[PDB]
mmCIF file of C-alpha atoms in Angstrom:
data_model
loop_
_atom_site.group_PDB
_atom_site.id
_atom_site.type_symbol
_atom_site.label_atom_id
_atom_site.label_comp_id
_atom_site.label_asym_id
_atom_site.label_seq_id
_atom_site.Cartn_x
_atom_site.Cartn_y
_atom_site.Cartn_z
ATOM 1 C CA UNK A 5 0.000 0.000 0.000
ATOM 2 C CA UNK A 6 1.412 3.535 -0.188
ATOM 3 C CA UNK A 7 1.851 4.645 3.268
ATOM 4 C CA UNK A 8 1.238 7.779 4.780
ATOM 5 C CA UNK A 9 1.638 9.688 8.019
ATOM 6 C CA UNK A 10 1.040 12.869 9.247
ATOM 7 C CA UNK A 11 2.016 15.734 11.841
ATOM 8 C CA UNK A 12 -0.307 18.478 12.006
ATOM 9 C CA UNK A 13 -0.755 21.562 14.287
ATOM 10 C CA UNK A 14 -3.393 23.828 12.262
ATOM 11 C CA UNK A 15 -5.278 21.269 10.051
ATOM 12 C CA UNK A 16 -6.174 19.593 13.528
ATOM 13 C CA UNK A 17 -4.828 15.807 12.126
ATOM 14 C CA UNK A 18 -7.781 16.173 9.485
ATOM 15 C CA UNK A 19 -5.210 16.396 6.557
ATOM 16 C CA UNK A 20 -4.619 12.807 8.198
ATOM 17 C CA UNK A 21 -8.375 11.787 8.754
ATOM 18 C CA UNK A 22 -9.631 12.684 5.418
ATOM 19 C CA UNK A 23 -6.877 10.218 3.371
ATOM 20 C CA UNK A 24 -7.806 7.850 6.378
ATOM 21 C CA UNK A 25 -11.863 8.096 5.656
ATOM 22 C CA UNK A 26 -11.369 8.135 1.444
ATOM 23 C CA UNK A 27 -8.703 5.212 1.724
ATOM 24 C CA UNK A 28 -10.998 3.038 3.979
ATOM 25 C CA UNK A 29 -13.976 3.611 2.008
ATOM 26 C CA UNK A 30 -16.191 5.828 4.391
ATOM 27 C CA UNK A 31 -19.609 6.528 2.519
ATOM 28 C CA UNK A 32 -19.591 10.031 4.057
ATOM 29 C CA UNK A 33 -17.026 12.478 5.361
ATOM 30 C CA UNK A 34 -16.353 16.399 5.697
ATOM 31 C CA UNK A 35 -13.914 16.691 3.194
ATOM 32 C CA UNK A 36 -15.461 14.008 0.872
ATOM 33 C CA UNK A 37 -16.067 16.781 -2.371
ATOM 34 C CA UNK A 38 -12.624 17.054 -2.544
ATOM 35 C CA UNK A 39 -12.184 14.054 -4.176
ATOM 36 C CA UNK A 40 -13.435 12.517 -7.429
ATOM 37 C CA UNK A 41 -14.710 8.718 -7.741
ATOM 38 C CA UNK A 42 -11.516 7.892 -9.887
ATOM 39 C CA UNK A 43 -9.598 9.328 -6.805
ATOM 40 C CA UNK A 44 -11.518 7.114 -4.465
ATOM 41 C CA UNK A 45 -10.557 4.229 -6.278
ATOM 42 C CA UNK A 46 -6.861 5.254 -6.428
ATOM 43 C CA UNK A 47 -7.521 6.018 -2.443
ATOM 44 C CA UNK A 48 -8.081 2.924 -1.186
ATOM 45 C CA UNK A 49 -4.252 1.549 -2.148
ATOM 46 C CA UNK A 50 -3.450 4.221 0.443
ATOM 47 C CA UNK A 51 -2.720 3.439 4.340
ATOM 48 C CA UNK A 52 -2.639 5.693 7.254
ATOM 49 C CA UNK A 53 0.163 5.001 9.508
ATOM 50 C CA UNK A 54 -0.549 7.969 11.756
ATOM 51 C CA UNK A 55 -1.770 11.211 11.808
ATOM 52 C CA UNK A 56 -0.664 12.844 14.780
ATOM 53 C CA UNK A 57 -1.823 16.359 16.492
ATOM 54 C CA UNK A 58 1.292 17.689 17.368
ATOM 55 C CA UNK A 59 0.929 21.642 18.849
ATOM 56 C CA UNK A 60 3.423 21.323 20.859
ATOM 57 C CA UNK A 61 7.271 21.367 20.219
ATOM 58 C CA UNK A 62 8.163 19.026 23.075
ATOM 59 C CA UNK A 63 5.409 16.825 21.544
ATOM 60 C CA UNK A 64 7.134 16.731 17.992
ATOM 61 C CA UNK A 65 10.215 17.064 19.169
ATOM 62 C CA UNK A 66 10.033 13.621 21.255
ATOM 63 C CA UNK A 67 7.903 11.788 19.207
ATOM 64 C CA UNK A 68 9.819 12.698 16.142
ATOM 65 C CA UNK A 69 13.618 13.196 17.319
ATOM 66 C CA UNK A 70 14.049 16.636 15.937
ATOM 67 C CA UNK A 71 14.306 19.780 17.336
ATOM 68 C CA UNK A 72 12.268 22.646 15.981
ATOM 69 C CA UNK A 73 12.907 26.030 16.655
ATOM 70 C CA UNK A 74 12.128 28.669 19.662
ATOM 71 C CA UNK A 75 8.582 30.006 18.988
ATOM 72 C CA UNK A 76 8.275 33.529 17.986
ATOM 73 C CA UNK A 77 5.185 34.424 20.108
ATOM 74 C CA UNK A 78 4.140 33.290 23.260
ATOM 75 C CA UNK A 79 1.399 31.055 23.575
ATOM 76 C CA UNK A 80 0.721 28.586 26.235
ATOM 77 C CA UNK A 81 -1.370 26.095 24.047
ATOM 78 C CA UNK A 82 0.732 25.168 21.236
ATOM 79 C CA UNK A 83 3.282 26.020 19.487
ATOM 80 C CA UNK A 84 3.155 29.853 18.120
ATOM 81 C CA UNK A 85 5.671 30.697 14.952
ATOM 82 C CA UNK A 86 5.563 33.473 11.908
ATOM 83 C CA UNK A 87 5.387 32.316 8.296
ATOM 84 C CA UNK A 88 9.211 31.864 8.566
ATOM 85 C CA UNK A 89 9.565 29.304 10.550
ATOM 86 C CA UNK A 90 6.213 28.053 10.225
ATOM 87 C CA UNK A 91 7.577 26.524 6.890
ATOM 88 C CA UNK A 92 11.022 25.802 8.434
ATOM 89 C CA UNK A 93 9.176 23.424 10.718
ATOM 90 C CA UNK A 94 6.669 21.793 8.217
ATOM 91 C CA UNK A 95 9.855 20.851 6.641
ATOM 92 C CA UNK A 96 11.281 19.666 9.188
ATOM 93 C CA UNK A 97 8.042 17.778 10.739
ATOM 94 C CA UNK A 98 7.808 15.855 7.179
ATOM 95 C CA UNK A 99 10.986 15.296 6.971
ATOM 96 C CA UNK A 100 11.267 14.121 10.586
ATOM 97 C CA UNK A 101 8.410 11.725 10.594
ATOM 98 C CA UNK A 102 9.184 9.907 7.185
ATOM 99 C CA UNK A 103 12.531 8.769 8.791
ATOM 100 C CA UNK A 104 10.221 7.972 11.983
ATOM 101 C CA UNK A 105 7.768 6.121 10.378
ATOM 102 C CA UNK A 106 9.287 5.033 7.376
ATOM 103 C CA UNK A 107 6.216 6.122 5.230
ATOM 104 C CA UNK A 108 5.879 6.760 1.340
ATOM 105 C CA UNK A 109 4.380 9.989 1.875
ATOM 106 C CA UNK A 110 4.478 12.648 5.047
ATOM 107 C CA UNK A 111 2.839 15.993 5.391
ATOM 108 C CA UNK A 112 4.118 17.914 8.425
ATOM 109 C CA UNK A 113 1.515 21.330 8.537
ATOM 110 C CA UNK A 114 1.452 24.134 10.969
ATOM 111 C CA UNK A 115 0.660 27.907 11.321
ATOM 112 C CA UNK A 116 0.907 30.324 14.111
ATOM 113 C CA UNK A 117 0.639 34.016 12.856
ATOM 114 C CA UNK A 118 0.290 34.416 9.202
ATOM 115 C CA UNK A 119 -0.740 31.707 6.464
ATOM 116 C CA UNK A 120 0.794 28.623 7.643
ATOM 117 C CA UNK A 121 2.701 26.096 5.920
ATOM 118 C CA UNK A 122 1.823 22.279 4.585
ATOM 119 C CA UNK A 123 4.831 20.251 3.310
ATOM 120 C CA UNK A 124 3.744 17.017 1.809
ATOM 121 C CA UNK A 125 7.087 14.749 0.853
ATOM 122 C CA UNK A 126 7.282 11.579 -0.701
ATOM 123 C CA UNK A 127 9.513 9.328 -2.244
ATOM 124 C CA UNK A 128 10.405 11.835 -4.656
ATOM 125 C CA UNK A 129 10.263 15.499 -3.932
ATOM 126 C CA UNK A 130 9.557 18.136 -1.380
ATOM 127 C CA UNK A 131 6.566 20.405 -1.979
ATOM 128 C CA UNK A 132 5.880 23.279 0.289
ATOM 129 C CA UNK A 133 3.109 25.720 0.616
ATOM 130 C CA UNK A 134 1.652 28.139 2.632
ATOM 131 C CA UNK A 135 -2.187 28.229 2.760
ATOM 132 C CA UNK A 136 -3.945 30.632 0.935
ATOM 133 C CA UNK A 137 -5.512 32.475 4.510
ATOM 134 C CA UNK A 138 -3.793 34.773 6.696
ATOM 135 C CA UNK A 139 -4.440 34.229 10.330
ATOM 136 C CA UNK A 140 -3.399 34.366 13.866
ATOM 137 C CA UNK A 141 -3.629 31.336 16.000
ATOM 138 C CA UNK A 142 -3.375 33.736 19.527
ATOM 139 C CA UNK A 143 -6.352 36.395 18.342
ATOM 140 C CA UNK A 144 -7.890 33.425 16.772
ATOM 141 C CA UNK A 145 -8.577 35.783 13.838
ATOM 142 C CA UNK A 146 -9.295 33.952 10.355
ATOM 143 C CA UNK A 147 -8.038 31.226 12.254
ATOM 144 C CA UNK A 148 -11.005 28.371 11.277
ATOM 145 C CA UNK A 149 -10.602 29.569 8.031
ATOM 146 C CA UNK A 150 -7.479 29.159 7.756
ATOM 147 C CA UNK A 151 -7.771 25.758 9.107
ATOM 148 C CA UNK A 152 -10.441 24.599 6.261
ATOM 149 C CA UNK A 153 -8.200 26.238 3.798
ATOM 150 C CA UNK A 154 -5.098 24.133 4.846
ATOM 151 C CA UNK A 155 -7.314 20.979 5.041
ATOM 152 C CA UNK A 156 -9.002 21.331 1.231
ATOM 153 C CA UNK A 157 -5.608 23.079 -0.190
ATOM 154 C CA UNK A 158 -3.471 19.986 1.590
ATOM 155 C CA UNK A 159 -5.723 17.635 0.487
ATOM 156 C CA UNK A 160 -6.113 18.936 -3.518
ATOM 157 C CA UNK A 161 -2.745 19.059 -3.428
ATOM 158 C CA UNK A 162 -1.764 15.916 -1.906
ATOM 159 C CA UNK A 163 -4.236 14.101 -3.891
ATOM 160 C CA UNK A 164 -2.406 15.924 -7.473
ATOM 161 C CA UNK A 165 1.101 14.857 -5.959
ATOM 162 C CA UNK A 166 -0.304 11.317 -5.362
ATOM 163 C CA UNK A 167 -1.607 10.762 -8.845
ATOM 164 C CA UNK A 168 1.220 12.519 -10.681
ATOM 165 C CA UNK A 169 4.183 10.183 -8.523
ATOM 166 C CA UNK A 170 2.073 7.257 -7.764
ATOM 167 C CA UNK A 171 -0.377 6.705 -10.342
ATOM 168 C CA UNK B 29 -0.105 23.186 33.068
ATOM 169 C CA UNK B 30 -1.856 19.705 33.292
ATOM 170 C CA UNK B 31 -0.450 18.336 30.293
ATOM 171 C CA UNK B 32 -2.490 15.948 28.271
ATOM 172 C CA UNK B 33 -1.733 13.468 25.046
ATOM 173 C CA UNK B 34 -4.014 10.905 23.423
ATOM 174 C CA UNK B 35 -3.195 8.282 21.092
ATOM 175 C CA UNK B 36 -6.687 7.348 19.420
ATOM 176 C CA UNK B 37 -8.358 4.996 17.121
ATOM 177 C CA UNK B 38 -11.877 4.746 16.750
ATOM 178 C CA UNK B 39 -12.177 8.081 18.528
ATOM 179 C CA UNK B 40 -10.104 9.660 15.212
ATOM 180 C CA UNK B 41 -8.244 12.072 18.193
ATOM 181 C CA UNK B 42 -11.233 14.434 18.551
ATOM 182 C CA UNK B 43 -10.453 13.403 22.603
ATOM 183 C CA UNK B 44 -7.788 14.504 22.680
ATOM 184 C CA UNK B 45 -8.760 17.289 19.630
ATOM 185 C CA UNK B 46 -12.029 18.786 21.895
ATOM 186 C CA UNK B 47 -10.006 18.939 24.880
ATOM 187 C CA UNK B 48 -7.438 21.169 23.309
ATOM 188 C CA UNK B 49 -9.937 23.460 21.584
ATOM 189 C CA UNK B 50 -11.591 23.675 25.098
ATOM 190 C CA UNK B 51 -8.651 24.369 26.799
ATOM 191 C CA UNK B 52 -7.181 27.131 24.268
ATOM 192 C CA UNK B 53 -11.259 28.778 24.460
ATOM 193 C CA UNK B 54 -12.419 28.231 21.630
ATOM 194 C CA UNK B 55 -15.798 29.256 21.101
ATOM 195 C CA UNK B 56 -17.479 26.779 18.782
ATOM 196 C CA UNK B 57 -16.470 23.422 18.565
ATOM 197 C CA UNK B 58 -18.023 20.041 18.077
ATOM 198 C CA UNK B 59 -18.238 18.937 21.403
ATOM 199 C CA UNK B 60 -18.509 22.083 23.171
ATOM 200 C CA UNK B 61 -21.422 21.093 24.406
ATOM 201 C CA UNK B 62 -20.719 18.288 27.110
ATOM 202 C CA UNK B 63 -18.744 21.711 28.707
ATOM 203 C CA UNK B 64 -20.126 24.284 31.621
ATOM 204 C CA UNK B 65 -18.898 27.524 31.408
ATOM 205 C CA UNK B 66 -16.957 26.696 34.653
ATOM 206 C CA UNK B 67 -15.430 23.292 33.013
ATOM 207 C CA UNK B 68 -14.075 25.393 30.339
ATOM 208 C CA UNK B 69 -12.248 27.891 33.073
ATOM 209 C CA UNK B 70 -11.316 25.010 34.455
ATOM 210 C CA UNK B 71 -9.823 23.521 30.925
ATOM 211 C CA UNK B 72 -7.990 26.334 30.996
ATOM 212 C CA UNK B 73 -5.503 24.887 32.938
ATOM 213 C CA UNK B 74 -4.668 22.121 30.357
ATOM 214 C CA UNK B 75 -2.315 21.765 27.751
ATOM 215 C CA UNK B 76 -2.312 18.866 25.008
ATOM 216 C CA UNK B 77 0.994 18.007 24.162
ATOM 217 C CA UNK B 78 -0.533 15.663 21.452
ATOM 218 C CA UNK B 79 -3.041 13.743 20.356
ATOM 219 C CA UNK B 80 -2.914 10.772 17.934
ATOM 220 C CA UNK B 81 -4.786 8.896 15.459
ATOM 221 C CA UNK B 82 -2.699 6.233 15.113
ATOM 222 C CA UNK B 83 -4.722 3.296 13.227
ATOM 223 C CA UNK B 84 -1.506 1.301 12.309
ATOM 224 C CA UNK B 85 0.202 -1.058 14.948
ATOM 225 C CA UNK B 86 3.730 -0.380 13.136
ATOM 226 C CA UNK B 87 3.006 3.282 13.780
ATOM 227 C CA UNK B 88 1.697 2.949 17.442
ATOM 228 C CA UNK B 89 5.068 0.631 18.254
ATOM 229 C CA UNK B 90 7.145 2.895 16.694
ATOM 230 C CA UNK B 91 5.488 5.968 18.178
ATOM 231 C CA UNK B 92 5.550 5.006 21.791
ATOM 232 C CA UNK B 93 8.416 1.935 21.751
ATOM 233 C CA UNK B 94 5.501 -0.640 22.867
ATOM 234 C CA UNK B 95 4.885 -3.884 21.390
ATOM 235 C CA UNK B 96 0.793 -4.494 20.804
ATOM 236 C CA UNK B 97 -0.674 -8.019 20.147
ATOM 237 C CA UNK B 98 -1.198 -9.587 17.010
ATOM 238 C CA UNK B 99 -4.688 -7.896 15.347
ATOM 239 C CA UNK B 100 -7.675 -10.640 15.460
ATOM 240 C CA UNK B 101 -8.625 -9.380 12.043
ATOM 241 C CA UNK B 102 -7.253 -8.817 9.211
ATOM 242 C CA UNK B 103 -7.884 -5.788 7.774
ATOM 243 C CA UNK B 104 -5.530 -3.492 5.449
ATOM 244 C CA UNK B 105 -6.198 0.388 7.179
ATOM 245 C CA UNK B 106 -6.381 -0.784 11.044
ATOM 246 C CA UNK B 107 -5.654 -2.613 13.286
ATOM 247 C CA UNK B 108 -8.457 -4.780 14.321
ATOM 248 C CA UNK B 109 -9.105 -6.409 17.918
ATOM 249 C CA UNK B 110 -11.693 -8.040 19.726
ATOM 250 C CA UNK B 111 -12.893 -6.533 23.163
ATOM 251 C CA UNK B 112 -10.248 -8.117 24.707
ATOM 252 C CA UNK B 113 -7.349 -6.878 23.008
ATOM 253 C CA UNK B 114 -8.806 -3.354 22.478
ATOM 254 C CA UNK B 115 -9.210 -3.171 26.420
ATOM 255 C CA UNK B 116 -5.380 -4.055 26.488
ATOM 256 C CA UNK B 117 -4.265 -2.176 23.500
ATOM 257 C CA UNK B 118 -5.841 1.076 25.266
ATOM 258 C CA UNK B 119 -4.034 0.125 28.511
ATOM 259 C CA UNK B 120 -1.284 -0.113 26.272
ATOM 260 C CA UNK B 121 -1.146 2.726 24.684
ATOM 261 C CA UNK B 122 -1.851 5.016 27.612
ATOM 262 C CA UNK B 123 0.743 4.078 29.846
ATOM 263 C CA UNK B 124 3.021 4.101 26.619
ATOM 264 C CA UNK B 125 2.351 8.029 25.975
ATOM 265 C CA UNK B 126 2.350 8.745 29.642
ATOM 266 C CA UNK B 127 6.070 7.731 29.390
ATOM 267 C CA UNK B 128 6.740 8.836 26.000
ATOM 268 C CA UNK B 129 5.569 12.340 26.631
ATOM 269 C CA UNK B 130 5.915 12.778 30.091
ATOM 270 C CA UNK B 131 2.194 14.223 30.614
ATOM 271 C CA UNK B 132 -0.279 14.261 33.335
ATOM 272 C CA UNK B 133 -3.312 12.417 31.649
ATOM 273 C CA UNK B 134 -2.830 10.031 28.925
ATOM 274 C CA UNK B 135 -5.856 9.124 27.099
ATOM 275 C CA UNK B 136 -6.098 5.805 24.814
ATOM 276 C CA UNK B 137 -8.555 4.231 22.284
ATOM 277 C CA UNK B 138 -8.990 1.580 20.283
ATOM 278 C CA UNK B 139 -12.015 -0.204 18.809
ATOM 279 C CA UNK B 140 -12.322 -3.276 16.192
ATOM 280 C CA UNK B 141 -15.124 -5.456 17.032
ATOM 281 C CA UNK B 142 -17.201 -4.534 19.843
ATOM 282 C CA UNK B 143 -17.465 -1.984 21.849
ATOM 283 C CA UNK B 144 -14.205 -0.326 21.992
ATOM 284 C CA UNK B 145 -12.292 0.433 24.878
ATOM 285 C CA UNK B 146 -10.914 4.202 26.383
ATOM 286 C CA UNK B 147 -8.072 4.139 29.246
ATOM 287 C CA UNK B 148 -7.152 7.384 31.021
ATOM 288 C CA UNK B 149 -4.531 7.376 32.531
ATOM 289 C CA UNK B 150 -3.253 10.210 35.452
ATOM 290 C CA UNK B 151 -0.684 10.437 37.632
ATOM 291 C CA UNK B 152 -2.946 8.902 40.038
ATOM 292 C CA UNK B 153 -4.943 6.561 39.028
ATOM 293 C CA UNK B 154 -6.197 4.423 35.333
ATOM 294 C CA UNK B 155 -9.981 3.982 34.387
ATOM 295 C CA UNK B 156 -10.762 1.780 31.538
ATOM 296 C CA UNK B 157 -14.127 1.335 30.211
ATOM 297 C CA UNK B 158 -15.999 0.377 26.636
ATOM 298 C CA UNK B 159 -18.108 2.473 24.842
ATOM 299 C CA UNK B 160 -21.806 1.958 24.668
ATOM 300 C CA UNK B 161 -22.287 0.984 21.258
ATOM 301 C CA UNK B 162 -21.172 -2.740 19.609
ATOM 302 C CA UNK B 163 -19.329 -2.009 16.067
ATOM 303 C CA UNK B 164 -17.422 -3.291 13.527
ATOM 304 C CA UNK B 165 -14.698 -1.403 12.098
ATOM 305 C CA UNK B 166 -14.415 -3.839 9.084
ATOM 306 C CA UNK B 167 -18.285 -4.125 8.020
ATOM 307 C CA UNK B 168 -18.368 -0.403 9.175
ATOM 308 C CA UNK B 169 -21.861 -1.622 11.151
ATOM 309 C CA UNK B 170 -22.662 1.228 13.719
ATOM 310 C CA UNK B 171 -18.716 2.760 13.602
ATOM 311 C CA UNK B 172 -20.056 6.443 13.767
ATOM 312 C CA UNK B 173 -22.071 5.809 16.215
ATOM 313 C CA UNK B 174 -19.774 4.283 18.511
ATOM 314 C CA UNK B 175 -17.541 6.787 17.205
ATOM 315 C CA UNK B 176 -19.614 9.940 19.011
ATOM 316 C CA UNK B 177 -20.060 7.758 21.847
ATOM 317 C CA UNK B 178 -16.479 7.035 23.120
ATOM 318 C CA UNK B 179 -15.560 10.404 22.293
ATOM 319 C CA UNK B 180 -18.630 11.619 24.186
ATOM 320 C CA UNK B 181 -17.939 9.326 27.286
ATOM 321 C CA UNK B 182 -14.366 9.946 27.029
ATOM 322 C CA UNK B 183 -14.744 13.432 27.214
ATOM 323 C CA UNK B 184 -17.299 13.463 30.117
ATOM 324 C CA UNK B 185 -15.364 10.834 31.580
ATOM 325 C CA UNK B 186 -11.755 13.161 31.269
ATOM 326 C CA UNK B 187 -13.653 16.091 32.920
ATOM 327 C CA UNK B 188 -14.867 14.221 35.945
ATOM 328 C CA UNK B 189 -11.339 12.800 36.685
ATOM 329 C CA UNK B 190 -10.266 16.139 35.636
ATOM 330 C CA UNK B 191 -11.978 17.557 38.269
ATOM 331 C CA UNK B 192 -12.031 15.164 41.031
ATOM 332 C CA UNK B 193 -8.189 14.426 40.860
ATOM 333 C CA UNK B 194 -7.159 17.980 39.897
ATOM 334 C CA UNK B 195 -9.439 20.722 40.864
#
């Protein structure tokens, strides 16, 4: 099967759930329209290994052996970075749990003040992204949009990367 | 902080998911409602270092360095266990994140056939029950349902412990 795992902070592990629900064959689930019925076919030759909830850097940082960098804002429930390093660290979440886990495909996402970042890395190349929705996870503003964004633009996107590599 | 981490199956980590959006104050979330006003002041106090949907037995043994039994079924995007071995695997996997992550409350779940099992796990004391609801992850027969209610009982379940062992 083609494995995948995930460590998310903004996207709340749904990045995860959603390639979890489509590759198991769930009738129903949120982000469902996303894919087509040929990609529902191609879906279910896809395992979950994990998709973890990570907003904390202890949390990724022992459960992945990495370190991540200090946070730029403080922000007692999870981890609270710019744009900068939010991409440094979606790099280095992917990166981190593909040597963990030993999975065909990770996607590390996270966002703290700005639009976030989702890498998605497989076998064969890197891609990184920010979403498309500027928010702050501390005022909470545009924050559950930004959220949905990451989920449907991670998702579209993984789902493109998967049938251009793997199919 | 009381620190918290899940590692969750059937329950898809929207444990250890609600008790982080409660605890950061968010305003609208999916299980809000099992929460007083006063339980959310009190959730204030919590922190989730992670929480985990971690289907795969590779994953979960890699994750927390335990060893889980042999799956009764077979089945390609879970693992799948009887009551028994759910009530064990739970067990399992608490005590595994309480020493992996070093938190407070570790929360567990697993369900295959049956009706699923939740441990939590404090520093004090570990409470293992099933959910209400018989299921069957492979024919998919009543899985949401017993779905909402672990995550329900977990949750009313974490805030009762919550409260009687920490407030």
């Amino acid at each position: 099967m083609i494995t995948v795992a995930t460590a998310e902070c903004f996207t709340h592990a749904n990045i995860g759930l959603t390639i979890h629900k489509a590759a198991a064959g769930y009738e129903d689930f949120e982000f469902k329209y996303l894919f087509s019925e040929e990609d529902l076919k191609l879906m279910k030759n896809v395992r979950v290994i994990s998709a973890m909830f990570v907003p904390s850097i202890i949390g990724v940082e022992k459960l992945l052996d990495i370190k991540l960098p200090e946070p730029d804002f403080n922000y007692k429930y999870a981890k609270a970075y710019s744009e900068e390093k939010d991409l440094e660290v979606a790099k280095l979440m992917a990166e981190g749990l593909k040597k963990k886990l030993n999975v065909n495909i990770s996607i590390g996402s996270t966002a703290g003040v700005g639009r976030g970042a989702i890498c998605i890395l497989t076998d064969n190349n890197r891609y990184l992204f920010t979403s498309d929705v500027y928010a702050n996870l501390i005022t909470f503003e545009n924050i559950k949009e930004r959220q949905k964004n990451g989920i449907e633009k991670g998702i579209k996107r993984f789902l493109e990367i998967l049938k251009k590599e793997y199919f």
